[PDB]
Symmetry: C2
Subunit: 440 residues, 2 copies
Amino acid sequence: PRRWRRAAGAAVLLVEMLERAAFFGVTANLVLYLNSTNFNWTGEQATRAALVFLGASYLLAPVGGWLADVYLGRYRAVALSLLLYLAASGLLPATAFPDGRSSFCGEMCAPVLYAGLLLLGLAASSVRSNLTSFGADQVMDLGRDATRRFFNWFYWSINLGAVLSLLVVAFIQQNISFLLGYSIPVGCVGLAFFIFLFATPVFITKPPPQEDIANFQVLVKILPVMVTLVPYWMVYFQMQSTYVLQGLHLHIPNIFPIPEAWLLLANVVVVLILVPLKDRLIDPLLLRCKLLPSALQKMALGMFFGFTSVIVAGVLEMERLHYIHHNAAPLSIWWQIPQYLLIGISEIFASIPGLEFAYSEAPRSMQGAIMGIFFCLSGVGSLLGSSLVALLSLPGGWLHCPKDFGNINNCRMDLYFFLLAGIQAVTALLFVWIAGRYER
Amino acid sequence: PRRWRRAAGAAVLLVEMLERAAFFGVTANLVLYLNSTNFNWTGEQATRAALVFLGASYLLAPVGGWLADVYLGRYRAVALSLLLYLAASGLLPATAFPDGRSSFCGEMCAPVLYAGLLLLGLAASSVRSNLTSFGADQVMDLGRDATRRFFNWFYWSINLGAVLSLLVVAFIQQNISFLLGYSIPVGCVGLAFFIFLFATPVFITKPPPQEDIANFQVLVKILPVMVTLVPYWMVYFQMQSTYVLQGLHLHIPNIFPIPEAWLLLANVVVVLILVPLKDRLIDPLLLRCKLLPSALQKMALGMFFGFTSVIVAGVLEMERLHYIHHNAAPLSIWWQIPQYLLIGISEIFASIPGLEFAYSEAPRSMQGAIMGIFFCLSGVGSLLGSSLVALLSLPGGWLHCPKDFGNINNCRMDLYFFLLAGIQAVTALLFVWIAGRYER
């Protein structure tokens, strides 16, 4: 933050959002190619595979980020991750040209796609973690309140990138043609790379025994606060789709003139609108009223808000069943915005304070490793939630509600929501206990 | 515990259970007299008034116990409380003889009954608190593990006294006559007084500025751990009758050949059977496995078990509604024993560890005052739960379920149980946070 800290922050947000846009675009492209050409298994997949692949990328995040911050530094880490992303996008014409497929699976299609997906996930996770490290370093050199404001703006920028990614890739790859849909990801990657390189003067670079052993004493005390986050992220990730399912069971209103995937972007626009209001209002009052939420009580309050959101969701579910018992209806579809706002509040109070706390136990030897493992927490939670949903769907029944739009089945939505509330409350109690042990 | 510590403990348990028996008997007698003779308001009461009067006695407990332990000592405190109880039982023949009523409300019935009830509550609360103080002193002079064992046995003895009280007063006052029903309470009071006086050699008596101010520093830090217990006791006390209501909505089975009040005694026999098993099994394993629940994590685990019991109750409620939706039935009435056992586990892990912790912050200047205020917590919780039930019954509807046996009304049992689970989870989170602050 020498003189253009606003410019540096804007460049970081732009490159992050463009990287996310390219990530979603190339993932959708390769998934469509795999489902299309031969790929004997065909993946048996048409939608939602993007979520599980993002979870796998977060799963690969810890080791890749650790390698980046140990044997590559911090600037070379993002440079090489973006170069590997260029390699993936230059492999993309092989997906485009039929000669590429003929040369790939005409000999020893599947293995090359596996290698490309692995490299793509590694590069995306590494660049995300190291961009977070760069931004945190710059704004910690700027100021602590500035650090919190930048973290909120960074999460908001990630959400904005996800929204723009979804809309732009859908429009380009479904409206005009395919070659433009191939040049758009490489184009945004190239312009983000040029933005990054143009911002290298204002960016501050950093250089890459008993101290390593002492770091294990920090790891063994900071891990329990983060492993207990796995159940919370699990609950939140299945809620992310259960809210969409609940809205699908309701009668959508017709006001002011893909629908099933639109609620996923609604959950993102909710955060897109809360973070500005939060940044401009809550922080000044949270500083003048002296609540003293020193990066851990904020997280506990976020998970308490998540529990309250589950409470509101269960109340709405029981209200829906009560109307059916009265003797199909919107069932107060306009009463889902309060619970969506509550879950967005929980998300913003658990992610940004989570990053801030992960940088409280930062010490600069493996600062990116802790970010990689924190994102691995969310990845593990999403993957385990998806596995639980699959287990309760086909043989379970609890998650088989979408079939027959939840008319006659063993849906047990009330039971699922109540058990989810119990799990969230147990997670909150564990988090409070572990936080109490942490300060000791 | 010189040589007959078993005898001293048995005498304390016997006098406590007999005092509770006389308490219930005389309360029922005076309530019946008030409802019967004229008492223009008539109380508008036939049953459940005993619970609210016990709550009022606990409400009077703090000030009376503080007076007892400040201006009377500890042995004179129980002596004078039992003497006041003798005064109440000697006022009882005025209730019996019509000449007593004619002399009471033939001039300036109501005021004398009010004074008698006030004195009875004061004496009962004072003797309960000071008996607890005596037992704790003796067994703390014996041993800490012995102190926990004695606390468990003391709660078990209170439950046994309640059961024997209910059965004996019902049988005597409904089967044979009234004069025997009048001599039974005075008889058990007299024999308990003689047991107490006969045990005075083995009993160890104790004698009755800046230190008082320093006690306020202890009070301001031990109160928050106990005020947060008010919501928990509130939830548990309305659960104590909501479980009975739920069992009433079920089809009772006919196996091995007042019914609505029998579940109240079932909730007591559940504790009557858990405390022996708990004492004989859990404590040795809790000491060999080294869980280290130093009188506070035990309380947190008790309230977590209470939350789990609410979870099981909600699961059962949703199961009951699901069968109705399937298209009255027992609805797994035998599946209420697990939730009753879980609520008994919560009660035993929240009361006995609660007493043990209240004696951890004992320092011997107002040791009985903290016991009086701890019982005042339960009294306030019971009274507030009863007020909430009344508010949700007549105009609310949530507690109006008993009318028409919950067939067609605004019962909202699912909503009530889910909101109760939310309140219990919030109470648990507050208790964990306050406990974390307590050790600091």
